[PDB]
Amino acid sequence: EHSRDPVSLDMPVGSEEEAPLGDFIEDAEAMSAENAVIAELLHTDIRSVLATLDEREHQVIRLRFGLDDGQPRTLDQIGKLFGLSRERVRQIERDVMSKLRHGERADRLRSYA
Amino acid sequence: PGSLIDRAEFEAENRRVVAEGGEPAAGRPVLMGITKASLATDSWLSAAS
Amino acid sequence: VVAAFQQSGNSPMGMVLDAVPVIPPELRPMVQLDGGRFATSDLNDLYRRVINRNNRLKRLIDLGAPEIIVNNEKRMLQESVDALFDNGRRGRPVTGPGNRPLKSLSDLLKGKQGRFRQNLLGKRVDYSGRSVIVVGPQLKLHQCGLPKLMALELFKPFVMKRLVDLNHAQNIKSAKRMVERQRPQVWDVLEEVIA
Amino acid sequence: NNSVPGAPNRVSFAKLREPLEVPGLLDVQTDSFEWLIGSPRWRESAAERGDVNPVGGLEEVLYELSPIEDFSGSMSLSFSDPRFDDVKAPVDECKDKDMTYAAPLFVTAEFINNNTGEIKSQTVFMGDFPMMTEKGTFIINGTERVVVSQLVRSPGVYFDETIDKSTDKTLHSVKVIPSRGAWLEFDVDKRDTVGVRIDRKRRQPVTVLLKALGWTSEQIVERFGFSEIMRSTLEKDNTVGTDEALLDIYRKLRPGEPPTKESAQTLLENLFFKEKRYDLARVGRYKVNKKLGLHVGEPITSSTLTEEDVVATIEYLVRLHEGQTTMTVPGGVEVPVETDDIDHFGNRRLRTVGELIQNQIRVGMSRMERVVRERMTTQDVEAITPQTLINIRPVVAAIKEFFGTSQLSQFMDQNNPLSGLTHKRRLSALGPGGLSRERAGLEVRDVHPSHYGRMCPIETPEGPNIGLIGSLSVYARVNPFGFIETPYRKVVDGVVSDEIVYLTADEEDRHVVAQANSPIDADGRFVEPRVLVRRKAGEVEYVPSSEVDYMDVSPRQMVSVATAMIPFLEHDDANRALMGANMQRQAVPLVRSEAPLVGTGMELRAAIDAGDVVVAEESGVIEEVSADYITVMHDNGTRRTYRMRKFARSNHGTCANQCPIVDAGDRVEAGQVIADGPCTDDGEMALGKNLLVAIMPWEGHNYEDAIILSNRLVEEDVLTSIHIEEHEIDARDTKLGAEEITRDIPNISDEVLADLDERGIVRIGAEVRDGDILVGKVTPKGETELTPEERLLRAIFGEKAREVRDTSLKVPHGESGKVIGIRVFSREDEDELPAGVNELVRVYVAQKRKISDGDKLAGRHGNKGVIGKILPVEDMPFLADGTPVDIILNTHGVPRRMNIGQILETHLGWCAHSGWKVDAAKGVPDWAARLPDELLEAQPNAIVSTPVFDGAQEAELQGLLSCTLPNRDGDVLVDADGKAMLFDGRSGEPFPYPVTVGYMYIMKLHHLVDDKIHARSTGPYSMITQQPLGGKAQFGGQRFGEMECWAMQAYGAAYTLQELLTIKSDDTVGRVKVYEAIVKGENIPEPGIPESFKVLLKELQSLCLNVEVLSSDGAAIEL
């Protein structure tokens, strides 16, 4: 596999008007529709849903995963920031996940999985 | 001399130079093919194609 | 020629180069085809030749050698730059595979495959299709009959917006999936959106 | 006179007896390869043909190569006697297993050392050879391959002629064209400098070269004394002296090198007389000898040019310039003096498969010989053996490259048997070693009077490749030298002879050839004193019946096989006939085939020789016949079983079925058809069905070539077809891991994966729709941090990251149908797969297509059409007895296109379907005097044939239309004129005037609408150009060219053009923004700058051209 000269893109392919091979290579990334509508609409619907939860819990999630400033706060770190204990964050996340799976939140976010 | 110059520009330059006393330039109309007319009067961007 | 240079206000020194530019890599991509068989444009080969010649020239100058070898190296570098800017414009063209000339840098512009004539040949557009035509004498002079499959695949974004608007689908992702599966709910909206 | 035992009986309007039966239609393909390899059959055929010395192709390449030796002379190797071995596997296994049908060959190499005088000999393996199957095809990597013969200008001497524009004086130019070597152009100019242009060098006087060859000046004077311009040139030359002439030649060819007599002499010998550097093929030498009439009393052994040939050429040129009609040379017979014609078929030879393969193996063997000679010059001489001296790699590489990439080795098109048979008999004038489309002039694309009987003047591509591709005529046979021949039965003294003789173009152009239609007495006496005659130069004129020398064999001698099955071709125009012949090769094999009611006699022979019908090899009795196989017990006690491939995909997606047409306990004669392949009804070609046609305009639904059909065709599956798609995915090892096929897939609902089986591939017989998963494979994944919500959901749901991605094969857009079969190859089971691949599975999807709007239909007379509408059976016009018409054709396209053969076929088809009974109680009517005695009666739905250029005359049809039998109701529907009174299917009232009705043969072309429909809104985009692009999953965009841009500019529509060129073509951010705008409520934003302009600016800057856009102020702006 290491002993093959790379094929030149300018080589005519298929005699299809002798258009070079380079002309037929898809960008293979940066899909329009995916990033265009799906991703940004997921982000907006999340900003709506997670906000509809407790605002304190919304900030907790923001710091936990890093929606705003990255830096996913661990259980102990976020407890220190909020003054709580490392053991409370597990139950907080359990409550958040339970809430997210019911109501209109599920209706909105059933896709994207 | 012997260079094709568009009638409008040629006449305007002749009038400008004559107004200050410069002697007039004697020219005669000449026709040319579509290819030559296109080449003479067009942008380099459009001419390269 | 001399008057063209004189009226310019610039200098003729621009003809003799001291630093060649390199196009952005996306214009000369290096992509992996299926099977791990790399594909790249010959511009990379030409630039590699130029870089190697220049580095070797610098090494010879730093080390110091009789002027014959240095002159040969300079001549090789000149020929390398010449081959980069144009192939076949002077001397024997360079060929790597099957005696096939490499597409030089100026070759992106001239010839049937050049950029200018390719632009003169037009582009390729979205929101379009084609099909066989059959006479329809039931139509008015301002009407045409589009097959529903083509109309659905061509009007999809409008259809999906109206589909979410009517609450048939909860979100754009679900509407896109519904259009892909072509559920029976789609045809009413499609007929409604191309009024 | 059905040659085959069990042919169907279809009486014919044949008023002439053909003395010669059609030869094997694949004989051109088979005989060339038979000569190439060298087999007993070819050897005995050649011995019968009178060829004094038969030498095979392979033993003519590797015997001319030998003996290879070093310059020192101490080493010399020879190898001869090429013999093959038994094939590896049958054709069935090679096609199914993806192997290549081949057989190894061994050549005995004798190594001899001159100094020691010893010998070492043993068989030498030389790689596998791609043998040719009985159908005249090659199976390369499991795909059927056909190599098409090539038309090339034969090596020889051509005395062209050009006329001066100013002087208006004839200028005779001579050209010598070797198969390999320098070219000599002895031209005469106004300045009279008769000179040679060696290898397109500078002109030099012919006198100087002639004296440079050792030709004394006095000899020039005496031999060329009759010539005045030549004598003047001799007196004009300045340089004199053999040494001076040689040095001048050397400087002209190789200036700046040490000039010596020895060097110049060696250069001349190497350039002309050396066999390796210069060679004329045996055909070239033979043609030169015939032209100059020299060395004609002995077989050709030396194949290199000689000084006698050059002097004879110069003498011929000067004699032609003088105006001499003929010349003589010592040791030669008298020959005519006239300029040659390049397009003449006496100059264009045909290099069949044998010649092409011989050339390729010759190139490979020469490369191998170079390597071998180097190795023997370097390697030790003591312990050397030819086994360690031969290198087989280059020859096998050359053969494989030829069979893979050569432009003359093409996929065998398999729409139907006729398409393949025509493909095998093609004569392509383009390709490697031949002319190109652009460089080739338009004069070579025309017909020549020498094509009569050798190349069909009708069958030809409609596209830009018109005139560069043709087909052998039915009776043509290729000569050993490659020149095409045709049969002519000689007439000795006005009495035509039964025995035939095959004449090439030259022999034909020295004789007087009559026409087959010429009235001939039963005793061979010409009744007409003046017989139409075709003579030299294409002249046609009357001659007394004694001067005539040769006569044709059949009126169908000038037409190809495809063009020979168009009834009433003599009434159709040449372009319409060409269109019909080309469209006959696009017909799709229907589920149920039906032979035409009216069709020429070529159907059965075409079907038999196409090879798609299994034909009993030996006479016997059938023991048991099943849908799959058939076993016949031969009379000698040996049983043979024929396996009939069913629902096997063809090269173009159609299906090839072979249904047995025999019953158990039935005796079958040798050569009788046993099963019918695609497009066959009882062993005769059948590309379409018989439909009741009514010719009239109907409500504008058949307006301008459109066609109206009855729904009865759709509901009865008359025009139903089966198409089989083929998909394949492979699991290749990757650096990050090994791809695998598994039923488990990341994050997909179980319902979508229900149809898959435990191994991860769809279960056979499962309906698969568009976009459905066809085989599930998971590829290894690297490291990619998940997006916020994706990872959060993964954590919440308990679904792990499942790094492995989804790359399962899925049904492309616009595909459906059952899954008839699955074929899986595994490296574990020791299967040959490409390097880096362990598992490869291919799934076959079968789709049944019923005719629908947009599909193409066409008769045999080149009258295409698209289905405008499919009316209900109750809306179609119906005959007086209630029979609806199956199809309606407009009458405005028949007389303008001038293909009245369509209407003639309609009338004869009605007469055949209804059956007729010619009254004979009072005596045979006048119009029926020439009808065959068996053609005065026909049962209903009978089969009849009208051979091309000899069939039913107009009087015959007029008489038959008035004698058709009545229906079961006892009433005659059509009148004596062939028209009938129809009823309106909608109004219910009779049409005011009678309409033409009859049964016509309609075929279903392969331009189906399902393939044509394309649509795109947003999909993959190119990488370098960022323009729309993609596969069939997301169809690519339609090009918007400059002419479309001009059309948009003329309207004054400025915004539409701006969008079409910026916002939906190239704007990387504009596309996303507009898609956002449409999917939301907001407006479409303003377009940006195309990427095709930023790219142009960067490319132009890279050339050190300071390109910058400036405003009115002149300030540079940023982009």
Next chain:
Amino acid sequence: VNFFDELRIGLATAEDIRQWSYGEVKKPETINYRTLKPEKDGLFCEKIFGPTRDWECYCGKYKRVRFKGIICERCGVEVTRAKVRRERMGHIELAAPV
């Protein structure tokens, strides 16, 4: 925006190439054989032409999205979109004039 009165073409000089290029190519290597990443000072270097992946760094020190126009001091690569890789140029320093 789209106010382009004129488009002129001139003869570029060495200083123009110097000041319209964002780096110098000093080695011929294109891509690493094993890790499939651009090599330093090569024909594909991120330091010269730009990051291969949007909002991503060659060394990963500033791999986070919220870093715009910040050149990573550890490797000197700017943190922007990948489309910049289609725009930025480079120049070679000829040892002798040509």
